[PDB]
Design an enzyme around this catalytic site. Structure first.
Site, mmCIF file in Angstrom:
data_model
loop_
_atom_site.group_PDB
_atom_site.id
_atom_site.type_symbol
_atom_site.label_atom_id
_atom_site.label_comp_id
_atom_site.label_asym_id
_atom_site.label_seq_id
_atom_site.Cartn_x
_atom_site.Cartn_y
_atom_site.Cartn_z
ATOM 1 N N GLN A 1 0.824 -1.204 0.000
ATOM 2 C CA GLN A 1 0.000 0.000 0.000
ATOM 3 C C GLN A 1 0.860 1.257 0.000
ATOM 4 O O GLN A 1 0.625 2.182 -0.785
ATOM 5 C CB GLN A 1 -0.930 -0.004 1.212
ATOM 6 C CG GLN A 1 -1.599 1.333 1.465
ATOM 7 C CD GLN A 1 -2.536 1.302 2.651
ATOM 8 O OE1 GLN A 1 -3.286 0.345 2.840
ATOM 9 N NE2 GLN A 1 -2.502 2.354 3.457
ATOM 10 N N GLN B 1 0.773 3.696 -3.085
ATOM 11 C CA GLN B 1 0.154 4.999 -2.871
ATOM 12 C C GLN B 1 1.164 6.134 -2.987
ATOM 13 O O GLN B 1 0.788 7.257 -3.345
ATOM 14 C CB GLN B 1 -0.539 5.033 -1.510
ATOM 15 C CG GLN B 1 -1.768 4.139 -1.423
ATOM 16 C CD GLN B 1 -2.598 4.403 -0.183
ATOM 17 O OE1 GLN B 1 -3.803 4.154 -0.164
ATOM 18 N NE2 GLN B 1 -1.953 4.906 0.863
ATOM 19 N N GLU C 1 -2.907 -7.719 -2.479
ATOM 20 C CA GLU C 1 -4.315 -7.419 -2.319
ATOM 21 C C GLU C 1 -4.721 -6.439 -3.410
ATOM 22 O O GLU C 1 -4.001 -5.461 -3.660
ATOM 23 C CB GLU C 1 -4.601 -6.822 -0.931
ATOM 24 C CG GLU C 1 -5.952 -6.146 -0.775
ATOM 25 C CD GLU C 1 -5.926 -5.063 0.287
ATOM 26 O OE1 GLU C 1 -4.847 -4.474 0.506
ATOM 27 O OE2 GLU C 1 -6.980 -4.810 0.908
ATOM 28 N N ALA D 1 -0.687 -10.037 3.251
ATOM 29 C CA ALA D 1 0.263 -10.609 4.196
ATOM 30 C C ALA D 1 -0.084 -10.334 5.653
ATOM 31 O O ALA D 1 0.586 -10.876 6.537
ATOM 32 C CB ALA D 1 1.676 -10.086 3.910
ATOM 33 N N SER E 1 7.137 -0.012 2.375
ATOM 34 C CA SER E 1 7.097 0.343 3.783
ATOM 35 C C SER E 1 8.002 -0.587 4.583
ATOM 36 O O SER E 1 8.550 -1.565 4.068
ATOM 37 C CB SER E 1 5.665 0.276 4.311
ATOM 38 O OG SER E 1 5.059 -0.958 3.969
ATOM 39 N N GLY F 1 3.309 -6.298 5.778
ATOM 40 C CA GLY F 1 3.798 -7.620 5.429
ATOM 41 C C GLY F 1 4.331 -7.684 4.011
ATOM 42 O O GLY F 1 5.373 -8.293 3.756
ATOM 43 N N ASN G 1 7.918 8.299 9.044
ATOM 44 C CA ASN G 1 6.564 8.833 8.950
ATOM 45 C C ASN G 1 6.290 9.861 10.037
ATOM 46 O O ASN G 1 5.450 10.746 9.850
ATOM 47 C CB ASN G 1 5.545 7.698 9.025
ATOM 48 C CG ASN G 1 4.925 7.385 7.682
ATOM 49 O OD1 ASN G 1 5.372 7.881 6.648
ATOM 50 N ND2 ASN G 1 3.896 6.549 7.689
ATOM 51 N N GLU H 1 26.498 9.844 -9.325
ATOM 52 C CA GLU H 1 27.726 10.494 -8.894
ATOM 53 C C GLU H 1 27.681 10.898 -7.426
ATOM 54 O O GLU H 1 28.739 11.021 -6.798
ATOM 55 C CB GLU H 1 28.003 11.718 -9.773
ATOM 56 C CG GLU H 1 29.464 12.138 -9.810
ATOM 57 C CD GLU H 1 29.702 13.369 -10.667
ATOM 58 O OE1 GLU H 1 29.421 13.316 -11.884
ATOM 59 O OE2 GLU H 1 30.171 14.391 -10.121
HETATM 60 N N1 LIG Z 1 3.552 7.779 3.991
HETATM 61 C C1 LIG Z 1 2.714 6.764 3.810
HETATM 62 N N2 LIG Z 1 2.809 5.635 4.601
HETATM 63 C C2 LIG Z 1 1.956 4.596 4.419
HETATM 64 C C3 LIG Z 1 0.978 4.658 3.436
HETATM 65 N N3 LIG Z 1 0.279 3.500 3.474
HETATM 66 C C4 LIG Z 1 0.789 2.714 4.449
HETATM 67 N N4 LIG Z 1 1.823 3.383 5.049
HETATM 68 C C5 LIG Z 1 2.662 2.881 6.150
HETATM 69 O O1 LIG Z 1 2.962 1.520 5.907
HETATM 70 C C6 LIG Z 1 2.934 0.769 7.105
HETATM 71 C C7 LIG Z 1 2.165 -0.530 6.872
HETATM 72 O O2 LIG Z 1 2.535 -1.103 5.637
HETATM 73 P P1 LIG Z 1 1.508 -1.217 4.401
HETATM 74 O O3 LIG Z 1 2.166 -0.712 3.139
HETATM 75 O O4 LIG Z 1 0.256 -0.434 4.711
HETATM 76 O O5 LIG Z 1 1.124 -2.782 4.309
HETATM 77 P P2 LIG Z 1 1.391 -3.641 2.970
HETATM 78 O O6 LIG Z 1 2.693 -3.242 2.316
HETATM 79 O O7 LIG Z 1 0.222 -3.493 2.024
HETATM 80 O O8 LIG Z 1 1.498 -5.179 3.435
HETATM 81 P P3 LIG Z 1 0.194 -5.989 3.915
HETATM 82 O O9 LIG Z 1 -0.967 -5.031 4.039
HETATM 83 O O10 LIG Z 1 0.483 -6.638 5.247
HETATM 84 O O11 LIG Z 1 -0.120 -7.067 2.907
HETATM 85 C C8 LIG Z 1 2.268 1.630 8.168
HETATM 86 O O12 LIG Z 1 3.176 1.913 9.208
HETATM 87 C C9 LIG Z 1 1.910 2.923 7.470
HETATM 88 O O13 LIG Z 1 2.312 4.020 8.254
HETATM 89 C C10 LIG Z 1 0.877 5.793 2.637
HETATM 90 O O14 LIG Z 1 0.016 5.865 1.762
HETATM 91 N N5 LIG Z 1 1.749 6.843 2.830
HETATM 92 MG MG LIG Z 2 -1.995 -3.933 1.864
HETATM 93 MG MG LIG Z 3 33.034 13.885 -14.659
#
Ligand SMILES: Nc1nc2c(ncn2[C@@H]2O[C@H](COP(=O)(O)OP(=O)(O)OP(=O)(O)O)[C@@H](O)[C@H]2O)c(=O)[nH]1
Ligand SMILES: [Mg+2]
Ligand SMILES: [Mg+2]
Ligand SMILES: Nc1nc2c(ncn2[C@@H]2O[C@H](COP(=O)(O)OP(=O)(O)O)[C@@H](O)[C@H]2O)c(=O)[nH]1
Lengths: 433, 430
Positions: free
Chosen positions: A10, A14, A67, A95, A136, A140, A202, A250
């Site tokens: 995510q 995102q 997902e 995950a 992230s 997972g 974050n 560089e």
């Molecule tokens: N800056 C920012 N952080 C995000 C965002 N979405 C999730 N996070 C961070 O990502 C962490 C959780 O990981 P996710 O990316 O949401 O989960 P995932 O990678 O989809 O893995 P699973 O959901 O377990 O399958 C949290 O601590 C959030 O703070 C976003 O859109 N922007």
């Molecule tokens: Mg997810």
């Molecule tokens: Mg040079």
């Protein structure tokens, strides 16, 4: 030349949305992938976009998730026509904030499909430069599947470099308790496969939005648009040409003195909200790079020693104004370099103005700067993770979830031993001789 | 001993090389179309050295090499970019990342065979190949790494011909990377054992000249490459104009190199003109002599007062009293005899050329084999050890195949070169 961006989970997906939206705004690309006629014209930006025979410009990006929910919004929103649907890969079962699910159980079902769609983009490139992984630290997929993909890229594309933009977790927006577990586990298995790793606390982006943009509780869109500004300044060297526009590869030669010390600290300025009237000089935005309130990872560089300092200027910036500001800061602040470093600042300039999202929360600025500094003080972030890790793992809390998904419990111990050595390696580097 | 094959490698190599071809093509009356539009016949007397025919005009005998195609297009887009042979551009599209090992061992070795094919091509159209000429930077990745590989490759395919280089020195005042001491040390380790003569072009000296002499607050590479192209035109004057002294590469090397490893020259010239139109000083012969032997006009950050001159080659240009030149050149010798080696009689040699460089009426180029050049290697050796004690940034060289021992050997041989330059600085006549 070309660069393939990979967005996992995510957070990675995102953020890639806010980044490729900003990339299109900077390069004048429309959501349908069409651009006006050149009427040559200096058209550097093909390192991140390919060209269809019909004049369509498609990002060299892959979006991966276990997902469909997040990526479904992509193949439904404004940029549904920008990407080829073959680049938007999704599973059905995620995950569940479990590294072992994304790396061992669920992630192995889709790893071969992802590498295939990446080979498609790699075979559409005449000269591949490397990969940009966006993930992230707590999720997972962002931790488990990313580290799996990093293991496989080193086997297939062994020569190519790999850069990661990692989202350091923070309790203000934390969606999982076991996020310290996943952070330690993915940092361990990816340490020997990553060439450069730009961490994004974050909590830093959260507080910068509250302080400088006056947003009470920032949404993910607020954090992502601020992050996309920094990611743009880092990649602008690859996407644009300029007489003084030093390439990013560089800067890595100065930022990474040792393979394990490849975690630079990015500091962007100025960040101004669009509410009142403002224009900051070069010396003021360069001073703001040394205020820890402007960093993207919470730590105090004054409590540490520098190994590199790179200034990525973009906007109305004259070199003599830079050296004048640097000479003032170097003799009016406390920048401690290790006694084996050259103590010099590496400067790049890109005369295109910083682009913001129209109607966004960031104001258009005449000039801006992103400082990439490799300081030992970033080891404070590892300590905050290692501590939350130690508290739970001493009780073996939540470990049964990981062991119940293909991971041996001893891999927790190995990953923590590596983080212990990584903290020693940062301690040892900062010592004189 | 007639035709000279020119080679430029890397970013800096193609930059100063293209500026050098602009300078001499004008002095020889050659427009970018290749045609001859000059007046005097001296310009065509020895044009076969650097140029070829097309029988439809004169074409440079130059080969352009780089692992990055960026400088390839900035050269062809230049004012004289349309005169070079299209087939003589040999460029890879990967890059060197300012790594000497990438250019010397990894991705430069997989391109060097393409260059030797162009080298072989230009050598067959030579009635009698005199030698080779290389422009590059020791602190970079392509010019340093692949350049020294090209030298060693030409050495094993042309062991009869002279290998001459125009190597520029890295400096923190105008540096692009921190691993420049590594690259320069590894490169000097090659030049000391492969090149017959090498002109040390210190960027720290070029910067100090633009800043403290030409009074330029922020010097650019164009400001530095102006001094380079002028220095290169002077030290090559006796090669392309009908002269008697130091006519070919070997005769110059036989007069300038008393010991094989001590073939590192300290070039200088006068007057120091900026990138403006022209000056009205109109220097006299006693002025051109005082300015030549002055540290403020040396293209190498070394004080001639700190060492002794083994051999010296002076080149005057423009209509002047040759009798007045001998009186000055003899004067500076017997007035500063402590700074000239006694055990080499008549070590200073002065030549004269009637044709001045375009823009001036009287100029003078200095070539010195001074023991003070050890200061330059001492400076690079200091920075090299400062990083190598902790083995900082070493993984990029080891990751490309280099063993850690190669660094120790290059460092050791450089310090041996410094000690030998000090060795003959202390030898006496007694
Ligand atoms: N800056 C920012 N952080 C995000 C965002 N979405 C999730 N996070 C961070 O990502 C962490 C959780 O990981 P996710 O990316 O949401 O989960 P995932 O990678 O989809 O893995 P699973 O959901 O377990 O399958 C949290 O601590 C959030 O703070 C976003 O859109 N922007
Ligand atoms: Mg997810
Ligand atoms: Mg040079
Ligand atoms: N004088 C001068 N020096 C240069 C120029 N370009 C690069 N350099 C120097 O060369 C070193 C970098 O090597 P470079 O030629 O850019 O990389 P390469 O293409 O791999 O050989 C730096 O120390 C620069 O100071 C130039 O145009 N003029």
């Amino acid at each position: 030349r070309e660069c393939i961006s990979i967005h996992v989970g995510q957070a990675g997906v995102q953020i890639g949305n806010a980044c490729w939206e900003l990339y299109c705004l900077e390069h004048g690309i429309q959501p349908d992938g069409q651009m006006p006629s050149d009427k040559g014209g200096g058209d550097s930006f093909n390192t991140f976009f390919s060209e269809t025979g019909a004049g369509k410009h498609v990002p060299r990006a892959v979006f991966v998730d276990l997902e469909p929910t997040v990526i479904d919004e992509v193949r439904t929103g404004t940029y549904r026509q920008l990407f080829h649907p073959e680049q938007l890969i999704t599973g059905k079962e995620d995950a569940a904030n479990n590294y072992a699910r994304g790396h061992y159980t669920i992630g192995k079902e889709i790893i071969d499909l992802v590498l295939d769609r990446i080979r498609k983009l790699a075979d559409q490139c005449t000269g591949l430069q490397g990969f940009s992984v966006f993930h992230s630290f707590g999720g997972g997929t962002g931790s488990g599947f990313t580290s799996l993909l990093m293991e496989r890229l080193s086997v297939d594309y062994g020569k190519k470099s790999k850069l990661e933009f990692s989202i350091y977790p923070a309790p203000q927006v934390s969606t999982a308790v076991v996020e310290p577990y996943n952070s330690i586990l993915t940092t361990h298995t990816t340490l020997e496969h990553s060439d450069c790793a730009f961490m994004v606390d974050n909590e830093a982006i959260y507080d910068i939005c509250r302080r400088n943009l006056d947003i009470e509780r920032p949404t993910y869109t607020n954090l992502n648009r601020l992050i996309g500004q920094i990611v743009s300044s880092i990649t602008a060297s690859l996407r644009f040409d300029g007489a003084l526009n030093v390439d990013l590869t560089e800067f890595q030669t100065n930022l990474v003195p040792y393979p394990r010390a490849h975690f630079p600290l990015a500091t962007y300025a100025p960040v101004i909200s669009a509410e009142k009237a403002y224009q900051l000089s070069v010396a003021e935005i360069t001073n703001a790079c040394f205020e820890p309130a402007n960093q993207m990872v919470k730590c105090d560089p004054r409590h540490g020693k520098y190994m590199a300092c790179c200034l990525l200027y973009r906007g109305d910036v004259v070199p003599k104004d830079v050296n004048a500001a640097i000479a003032t800061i170097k003799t009016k602040r406390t920048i401690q370099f290790v006694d084996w470093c050259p103590t010099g600042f590496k400067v790049g300039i890109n005369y295109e103005p910083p682009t913001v999202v129209p109607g966004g929360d960031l104001a258009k600025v005449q000039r801006a700067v992103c400082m990439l500094s490799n300081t030992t003080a970033i080891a404070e972030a590892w300590a905050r993770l290692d501590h939350k890790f130690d508290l739970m793992y001493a009780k073996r809390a939540f470990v049964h979830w990981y062991v119940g998904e293909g991971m041996e419990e001893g891999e927790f111990s190995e990953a923590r031993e590596d983080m212990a050595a990584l903290e020693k390696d940062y301690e040892e580097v900062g010592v004189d001789s | 001993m007639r035709e000279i094959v020119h080679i430029q490698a890397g970013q800096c190599g193609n930059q100063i090389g293209a500026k050098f071809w602009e300078v001499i093509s004008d002095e020889h009356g050659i427009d970018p179309t290749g045609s001859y539009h000059g007046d005097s016949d001296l310009q065509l007397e020895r044009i076969n050295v650097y140029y070829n025919e097309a029988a439809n005009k004169y074409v440079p005998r130059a080969i352009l090499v780089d692992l990055e195609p960026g400088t390839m297009d900035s050269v062809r887009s230049g004012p004289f970019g349309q005169i070079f042979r299209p087939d003589n551009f040999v460029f890879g599209q990967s890059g060197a990342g300012n790594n000497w090992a990438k250019g010397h061992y990894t991705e430069g070795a997989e391109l060097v065979d393409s260059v030797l094919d162009v080298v072989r091509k230009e050598s067959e159209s030579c009635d009698c190949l005199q030698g080779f000429q290389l422009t590059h930077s020791l602190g970079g990745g392509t010019g340093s790494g692949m350049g020294t590989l090209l030298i060693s490759k030409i050495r094993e395919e042309y062991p009869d011909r002279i290998m001459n280089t125009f190597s520029v020195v890295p400096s923190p005042k105008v540096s692009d990377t921190v691993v420049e001491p590594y690259n320069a040390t590894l490169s000097v380790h090659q030049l000391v054992e492969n090149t017959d003569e090498t002109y040390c072009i210190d960027n720290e000296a070029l910067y100090d000249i633009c800043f403290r002499t030409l009074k330029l607050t922020t010097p650019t590479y164009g400001d530095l490459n102006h001094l380079v192209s002028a220095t290169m035109s002077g030290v090559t004057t006796c090669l392309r104009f009908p002269g008697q002294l130091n006519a070919d590469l070997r005769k110059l090397a036989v007069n300038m190199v008393p010991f094989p490893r001590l073939h590192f020259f300290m070039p200088g010239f006068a007057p120091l003109t900026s990138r403006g139109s022209q000056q009205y000083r109109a220097l006299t012969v006693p002025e051109l002599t005082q300015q030549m032997f002055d540290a403020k006009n040396m293209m190498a950050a070394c004080d001639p007062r700190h060492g002794r001159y083994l051999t010296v080659a002076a080149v005057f240009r423009g209509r002047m009293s040759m009798k007045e030149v001998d009186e000055q050149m003899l004067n500076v010798q017997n007035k500063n005899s402590s700074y000239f080696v006694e055990w080499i009689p008549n070590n200073v040699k002065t030549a004269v050329c009637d044709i001045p460089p375009r823009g001036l009426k009287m100029s003078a180029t200095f070539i010195g084999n001074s023991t003070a050049i050890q200061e330059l290697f001492k400076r690079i050796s200091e920075q090299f050890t400062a990083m190598f004690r902790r083995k900082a940034f070493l993984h990029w060289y080891t990751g490309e195949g280099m063993d850690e021992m190669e660094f120790t050997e290059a460092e050791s041989n450089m310090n041996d070169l410094v000690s030998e330059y000090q060795q003959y600085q202390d030898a006496t006549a007694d």
